């Protein structure tokens, strides 16, 4: 697998700065803005 950032309407994504997918929690991936999703 899951990804705690999928499907949320807060700014949880902004707690997870990423430069690559492996910076992200669970099976989340790094998105175009440099934060996980």
From Swiss-Prot:
UniProt subcellular location: Secreted
Record flagged with keyword Ligase: no
Keywords: Disulfide bond, Knottin, Plant defense, Protease inhibitor, Secreted, Serine protease inhibitor
Gene Ontology molecular functions: serine-type endopeptidase inhibitor activity
PTM section of the record: This is a cyclic peptide.
GO cellular component, as recorded: extracellular region
GO biological process terms held by the UniProt record: defense response; negative regulation of serine-type endopeptidase activity
Residues forming coiled coils: none
Disulfide bonds: 18-30, 24-36
Superkingdom, natural source: Eukaryota
Its job: Inhibits trypsin; probably participates in a plant defense mechanism.
Comment, domains: The presence of a 'disulfide through disulfide knot' structurally defines this protein as a knottin.
Family designation: Belongs to the protease inhibitor I7 (squash-type serine protease inhibitor) family.
The protein's name: Trypsin inhibitor 1
Organism: Momordica cochinchinensis
Residues shown, of full length: 14 to 34 of 34
């Amino acid at each position: 697998x899951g990804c705690i950032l999928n499907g949320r309407t807060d700014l949880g994504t902004l707690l997870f700065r990423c430069r690559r997918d492996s910076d992200c929690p669970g099976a989340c991936i790094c998105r175009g803005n440099g934060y996980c999703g």
